Design a protein around this ligand. Sequence first.
Ligand SMILES: *[C@H]1C(Br)=C(CO)[C@@H](O)[C@H](O)[C@H]1O
Length: 489
Amino acid sequence: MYSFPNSFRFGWSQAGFQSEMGTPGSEDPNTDWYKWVHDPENMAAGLVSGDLPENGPGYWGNYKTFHDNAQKMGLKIARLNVEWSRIFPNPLPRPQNFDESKQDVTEVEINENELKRLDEYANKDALNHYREIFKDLKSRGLYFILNMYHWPLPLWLHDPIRVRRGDFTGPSGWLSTRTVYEFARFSAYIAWKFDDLVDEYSTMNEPNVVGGLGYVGVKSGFPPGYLSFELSRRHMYNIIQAHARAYDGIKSVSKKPVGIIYANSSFQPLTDKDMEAVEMAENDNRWWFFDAIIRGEITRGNEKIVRDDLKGRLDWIGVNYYTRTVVKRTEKGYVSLGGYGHGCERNSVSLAGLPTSDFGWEFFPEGLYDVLTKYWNRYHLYMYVTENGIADDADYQRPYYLVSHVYQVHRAINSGADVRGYLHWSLADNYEWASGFSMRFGLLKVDYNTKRLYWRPSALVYREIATNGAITDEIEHLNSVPPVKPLRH
Ligand SMILES: *[C@H]1C(Br)=C(CO)[C@@H](O)[C@H](O)[C@H]1O
C-alpha cells in the first residue's frame, strides 16, 4: 500500500465559468469568455465549438448534489474560484491619482474606506449565493482553497472581439495596468467578505496559459486571439504585478496563506544530448515567473534587477500537471517535438508508444514527480497538486491515470517534498473552453440534458484512495500504463 500523511487531503478543483451555469438564473453574460464563445465569426472560423456555457452542469443551482457526491467519495479539500464578473458586473469609475501610461504598479492602497466604497458597486445577490455555496462546502468537512481568477474578466475590463480585430482603444484586459489595479482591489474585497470560510487563497489559475494561448497559440481559440509576441510579454509582466498587488491586498485583510496555481509541463530530453535544452525550457516556462514573485528577480529593458514590491509575494505553489513536453537542442536554442506530450493524435499512441487521451495528451505520470521535486529543490515552498486529470468519457484510462499520478505524489513526499494535497480535475464534466462539452474530465459523468451526475468506475477507485488515505493493496495494479493493444492506434 502507499499511505499518505494523516494531514494530506484528497479532493478536487473546479472553475466557475466551466461548472456554474446550466440551472435557473445562473447565467453570467458579462465576461470576455461569454462574448467570445457566442461570437458569430469565432463560430464560423471554428475557433470555438458553438457549445455554450449556459447549457453547462449547473453547479450554481445543484451545488448540494456536487458536495453530497464529494462527501460520499471521502474528499476532504476543494479548490473553487469566484467569478469577478458576477460580483462587479458594472464599470467602476477610473480612479484619480493613477496614470495608465506608467509600466510599473508597485502599490495599490486598500483600507476599510476603499472596501466600504466597493460595497456600493457589488452584486449582493451573487455574494450571498457564493456564501451559501461555501457554507454548504465547509459543512461537509471540506478544507477550502479559494482562487480569485480562473480566466474570464468582466467585459468592462476586456472586450476581446475589439482586440481580435486589432482595435486597442477599448478595455484591453491584462494588457492594461487598469486591470492590475482593479484585480488587487477585487482580491482584497473577496478576502474581506469571505475570510471566515476560506482556509487558503490563490490569486490566479494558470495565468501563463491565458497569455500564451490568447496572444501566441491563436489556433486554440482563446480570447482575444491576437497574434503578438510583444503583447504576450506585456500580458505576463502585468500578470506578475497583478499577483504581487493581490497578495498585498489579501494580506491587508487576512493572515491566511496566499499562493498561485500555474500550468506545468515536465520537460524531457529527446536524446541524452538535450539536457541543456530541458534547463532552457524550464527557465523560459517556469523559473523566470517564480523567480519574479518569490525572489523579486526580473529582466526589464535587457537588465537583471530585483523589485522589492515583487519579492516574497508567495506562501505556496499550486502544481497543475497533465503531460510532458519533449525538447531538443537547436543551433539557435531548443524546440518542442510533435508526437509527444500535448501534441499527439486523439485516442492513439504517442511516438513513444504511450496511450493518448480524448484530447491527444500523452500518458506520462513520472513528469509529476519531476515537477514537484524540481519546485521543492529550488524554492522549498509547500505545494498542492491543484489540477491533474484526463479527458476520457468512456473511463478506459482514468483509473490508471488517477492511481499512477497519486503514486508519483507519494514518491515526491518520500523524496522529502512538502506536498499537502491532491486535487483531481474534476469532480464532474464541465465546459472545456473553446472545445465545449465533448472533452469530459469528470470522475462523475454529466447528462447535460437533465444535469444528473453518474459515478464512473474511476470515482469508485478515488473513493478507495480518499477514504483510506492511501493507494490500497487491492488497487495497486492500476499504478501502470493503460494497455494499448485493445485501444485505438
Ligand atoms: C486545467 C486543465 Br488540464 C483543463 C483541461 O484543459 C481546464 O479545463 C482547466 O480550466 C485548466 O485549469
